[PDB]
């Protein structure tokens, strides 16, 4: 069963969890080609492993900047969780290392760009399209939650499309292995669940609220709570007032009403039956889950990639050179990295 697979998968995760991999490369093994993306904490560069000739995405965290934004424990969770995990819709971490100035996470390059890029251009996805993606995120959270992991930053900007047109969840910067509750205010304003903003202390259920936001945005072209500045967004979320486009199927409206339930005792994903209330929902009736997991479903959108190392599905960013100090900067703080 699914229950048997998750058990095997937990053991694999624990062995890597207790004994994490470390210093398995350095900078000069890599050709820096182009910046693929940027964030609040780090930048990602397309890179080339010079001995194998493979292309990878390398995330660069500037140690000092990590310390000034109070993300040390978060950055240590990111590397440890990511090197331990193994699912078909999670990016693979191949190498990690550090030097005097920075922390590096070389990852599987995903040539299709972000879901964000395509969703904004096209405007919105058809329901069947959104469903293809939703299902994959549903299975990915089932896996992550069974390992006591919360993800905490689901957004189109962290969902890469691979060559097969499938999802690779990237960015485990707020990932955290927790049994019981957690209180850190983090995520992305539009995707924040009401518990986070209200400082209640929260659990896995915030990922399922985030899935309901994602589905709404994929299917509508816009998030269910937007405004010009974050405080107005937080206002609408807590208000627990959503309006649906008239072109949403009744089934979709119904899925979403349970996922965007402000009352986290009645929110799908957090009930007795757990993730099955979502999987056996009317909206997912056509979805063959095992097929989705095996990647033997026909993707409705395969991005165009003219050869390897093509970056035409990513925006252009301003480049910055990688400066490494002669002196080690925050050595004690990142010793386990």
């Amino acid at each position: 069963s699914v229950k048997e697979f998750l058990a095997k998968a937990k053991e694999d995760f624990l062995k890597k969890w207790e004994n994490p991999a470390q210093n398995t490369a350095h900078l000069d093994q890599f050709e820096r080609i182009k910046t693929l993306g940027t964030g609040s904490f780090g930048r990602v560069m397309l890179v080339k492993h010079m001995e194998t000739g493979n292309h990878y995405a390398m995330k660069i965290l500037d140690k000092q900047k990590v310390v000034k934004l109070k993300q040390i424990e978060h950055t240590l969770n990111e590397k440890r969780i990511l090197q331990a995990v193994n699912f078909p819709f999670l990016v693979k971490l191949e190498f990690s290392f550090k030097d005097n100035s920075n922390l590096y996470m070389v990852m599987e390059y995903a040539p299709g760009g972000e879901m964000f890029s395509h969703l904004r251009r096209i405007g919105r996805f058809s329901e069947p399209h959104a469903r293809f993606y939703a299902a994959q995120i549903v299975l990915t959270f089932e896996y992550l939650h069974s390992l006591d992991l919360i993800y905490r930053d689901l957004k189109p900007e962290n969902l890469m499309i691979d060559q097969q047109g499938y999802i690779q969840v990237t960015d485990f910067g707020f990932a955290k292995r927790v049994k019981g509750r957690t209180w850190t205010l983090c995520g992305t304003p539009e995707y924040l669940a009401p518990e986070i903003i209200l400082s209640k202390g929260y659990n896995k259920a915030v990922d399922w609220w985030a899935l309901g936001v994602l589905i709404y945005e994929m299917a509508a072209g816009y998030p269910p709570f937007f405004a010009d500045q974050p405080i107005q967004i937080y206002e609408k979320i807590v208000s627990g007032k959503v309006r649906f486009p008239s072109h949403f199927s009744s089934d979709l409206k119904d899925l979403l009403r349970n996922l965007l339930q402000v009352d986290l005792t009645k929110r799908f994903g957090n009930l007795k039956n757990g993730v099955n209330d979502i999987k056996n929902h009317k909206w997912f009736a056509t979805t063959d889950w095992i097929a989705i997991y095996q990647r033997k479903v026909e993707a409705p959108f395969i991005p165009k990639f003219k050869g390897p190392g093509d970056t035409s599905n990513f925006d252009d960013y301003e480049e910055e050179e990688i400066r490494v100090s002669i002196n080690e900067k925050c050595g004690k703080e990142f010793s386990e990295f």
């Binding site: 930053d153 992305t188 816009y222």
Partner: peptide, 20 residues
């Protein structure tokens, strides 16, 4: 329309994460 309000808003570009 809602889509039009969204498109005239300040948050149609990529959204970075918050923190403490």
């Amino acid at each position: 329309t809602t889509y039009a309000d969204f498109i005239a808003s300040g948050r149609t570009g990529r959204r970075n994460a918050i923190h403490d």
